[PDB]
């Protein structure tokens, strides 16, 4: 009697506010029109509703308190009232012991996604002689949210001797999945390994988190299992009842700001919030974040479009301090420092008896940024795999389990020291690094940074760092992903005449100073005008972008 009173009360409240009613109206009308277009020319949305915690507070604090205190009594009847209405219409650190048996909002990182298996709920069985169907359900502790008597064996020959032929199609199924979320590592105490728990999803939310993202989670803390009173520490935990959580004036501001001619320089100086000089270096980070164009050839292979730069310089020129700026400003990047053994270029498959995979560092940074620190200090083992990652954009893993082949087209930035000391221009331009020769042609830009001692520069470094101890960034990444979907460019005739003369300069006179001169350099000549056109959001390719690229080659090398 209690259940129907809670049902009718919440139904009255849901009937009290019609704001959600027109939402369900749009749900039903849209699914109707979607099935209407699918059944007229040729000859999706679920039923769960976001309920704000707005009106529940202005109606009954008793009922409010009941939801956030004992949710195992009010969410099922409220959904029951909703389904009736649908039919009438047609921190982990302080999480244990207390902050328990309630609805908990959890934040953290998506990691180690498990496997997808479906689960049966409603059985359909046909009897031969009676010529009738039947009905039988089964429940487990994930689905009921209430401690009910479990009813597990698949039925046959129930009452008279009629063959209970089971049927399908009409028999229902629901998928199932469990994932782990550890809290954010910067939030941790003085110095420790972060500790974690897990949350189980349901049917329409299977495979929404891949290992490696930033996710807010809202759900209910559910504890199952016989805690050692079965036959020594039990009562293992998990979380259920879940949701997934990762302007026109603003976009008009974007279109309005982009109507200028020197914002590349303005954004260039913008990306130096604490570093003096290195103007064209910031210009190159803008062009890397632009990402270039992708032109897959006719029945051939794709051509890589992003740009990768490794640095070398005197050990005091923000070599490592330029990296975290690129870390925070871009999107979906992972920083690798020092060693990278067993998991940068591979997945290793160490995981019922089966073989599973965990996406490695190079794979997880797909369509993103790879931050590599101390490239010469990397052991010689993975150096072979770096050529494959950087040139064919694929990773083939052939271990004893299953040989596979996949895609990762990541952007990579590295930072290395000279071989010994500061002799970066003293000995010879060649092999001040003692890197393999193919890696020279593999990387796009190679910066040589000196530590030239002067005085105007000395005073300017002084007041910059000194006032440091005593237009903006969020506008920029929005400007980036907006510039991604409609500013894709196309090459023009004017793009040819400059880079041809430029490649002639690369072979007739550039070889007299340094090396190498590859056709890949000419590909970068196309990519820079492309990225300049993406930053200016142009559609064509202009001669002026190539004029900029000539200075970019001179500043990067000569």
């Amino acid at each position: 009697a209690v259940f129907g009173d809670r049902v009718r009360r919440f139904q009255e409240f849901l009937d009290t506010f019609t704001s959600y009613r027109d939402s369900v109206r749009s749900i039903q009308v849209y699914n109707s029109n979607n099935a209407a277009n699918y059944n007229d020319d040729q000859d999706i949305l679920p039923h769960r509703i976001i309920i704000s915690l707005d009106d529940l507070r202005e109606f009954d604090r008793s009922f409010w308190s009941g939801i956030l205190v004992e949710p195992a009594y009010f969410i099922p009847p409220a959904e029951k009232a909703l389904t009736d209405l649908a039919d009438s219409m047609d921190s982990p650190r302080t999480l244990t012991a207390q902050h328990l048996n309630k609805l908990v909002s959890v934040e953290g990182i998506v990691t180690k996604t498990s496997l997808v298996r479906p689960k049966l709920i409603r059985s359909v069985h046909y009897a031969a002689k009676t010529g009738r169907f039947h009905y039988r359900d089964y429940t487990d502790a994930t689905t009921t949210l209430t401690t009910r008597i479990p009813t597990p064996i698949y039925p046959t020959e129930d009452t008279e001797g009629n063959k209970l032929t089971t049927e399908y199609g009409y028999s229902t199924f629901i998928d199932h999945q469990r994932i782990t979320v550890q809290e954010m590592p910067e939030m941790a105490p003085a110095g420790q390994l972060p500790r974690s728990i897990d949350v189980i999803l349901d049917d329409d939310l299977v495979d929404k988190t891949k290992p490696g993202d930033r996710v807010n989670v809202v759900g209910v803390f559910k504890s199952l299992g016989a805690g050692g009173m079965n036959q020594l520490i039990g009562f293992k935990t998990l979380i259920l009842g879940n949701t997934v959580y990762p302007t026109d004036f603003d976009i008009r501001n974007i279109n309005k700001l982009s109507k200028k001619k020197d914002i590349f320089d303005i954004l260039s100086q913008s990306l130096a919030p604490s570093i003096y000089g290195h103007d064209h270096i910031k210009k190159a980070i803008l062009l890397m974040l632009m990402g270039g164009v992708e032109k897959n050839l006719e029945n051939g292979s794709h051509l890589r479009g992003d740009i990768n730069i490794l640095m070398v310089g005197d050990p005091s020129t923000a070599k490592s301090q330029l990296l975290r700026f690129v870390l925070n400003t871009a999107s979906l990047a992972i920083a690798t420092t020092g060693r990278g053994s067993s998991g940068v270029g591979l997945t290793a498959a160490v995981t019922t008896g089966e073989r599973r995979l965990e996406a490695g560092a190079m794979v997880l940074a797909d369509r993103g940024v790879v931050c590599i620190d101390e490239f010469d200090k990397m052991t010689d083992v993975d150096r072979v795999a770096i050529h494959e990652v950087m040139e064919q954009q694929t990773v083939t893993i052939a271990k004893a389990g299953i040989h596979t082949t996949l895609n990762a087209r990541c952007s990579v930035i590295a930072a290395a020291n000279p071989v010994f000391g500061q002799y970066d221009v003293n000995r010879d331009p060649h092999q001040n690094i003692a890197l393999p020769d193919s890696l020279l042609s593999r990387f796009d830009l190679l910066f040589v940074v000196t530590d030239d001692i002067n005085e105007i520069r000395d005073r300017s470094i002084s007041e910059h760092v000194l006032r440091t101890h005593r237009v903006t960034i969020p506008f920029l990444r929005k400007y980036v992903q907006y510039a991604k979907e409609r500013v894709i460019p196309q090459l023009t005739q004017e793009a040819i005449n400059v880079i041809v003369k430029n490649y002639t300069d690369l072979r007739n006179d550039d070889n007299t100073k340094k090396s190498p001169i590859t056709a890949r350099t000419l590909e970068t000549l196309i990519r820079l005008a492309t990225a300049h056109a993406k930053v200016r959001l142009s559609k064509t390719v202009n001669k002026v972008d190539a004029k900029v690229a000539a200075n970019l080659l001179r500043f990067a090398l000569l």
């Binding site: 040729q42 000859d43 997808v116 298996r117 479906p118 689960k119 049927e167 399908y168 199609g169 009409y170 028999s171 229902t172 199924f173 629901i174 998928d175 049917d203 495979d207 891949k210 490696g212 997945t347 995979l357 996406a359 997880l364 797909d366 369509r367 299953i402 596979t404 082949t405 996949l406 895609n407």
Partner: protein
């Protein structure tokens, strides 16, 4: 004898083409929701790690050896259980029951083989790992 015990033939269904559906299906493994069981689907992919063909037992004959009848056990599951000494009509209501055993030439088999299908790697999302799936093959 049941008519299922004496068949010698098979029946194959037949899918509809998309041209007449246009006049009067491209699925992915990720698009294969685990809720379409019992339905009719159409997939595409790459055959990977094909196994070998081995015989599948269908029905079991049982020789009476005393009364001279033949007992039959039809199996459609993976496993089953042994039965009694005899299930003849004459061995029953008698002190000395028979003793049975199976037979090979009287049993019926069927072609059985399976393999794995890998994803197209063109329809794979940008940050996922491609899955695979098992498909059983029987008969012709």
């Amino acid at each position: 004898f049941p008519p299922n015990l004496t068949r010698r033939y098979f029946l194959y269904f037949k899918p509809l083409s998309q041209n007449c559906a246009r006049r009067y299906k491209p699925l992915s493994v990720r698009q294969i929701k685990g809720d379409f069981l019992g339905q009719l689907i159409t997939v595409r992919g790459i055959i990977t790690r094909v196994s070998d063909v081995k015989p599948a037992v269908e029905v079991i004959a049982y020789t009476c050896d005393q009364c001279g009848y033949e007992v039959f056990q039809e199996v459609n599951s993976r496993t089953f259980t042994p039965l009694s000494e005899c299930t003849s009509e004459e061995c029953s209501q008698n002190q000395t029951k028979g003793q049975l055993f199976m037979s090979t030439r009287a049993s019926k088999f069927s072609a059985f083989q399976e393999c794995k299908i890998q994803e197209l790697s063109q329809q794979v999302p940008v940050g996922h790992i491609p899955r695979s799936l098992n498909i059983h093959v029987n008969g012709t």
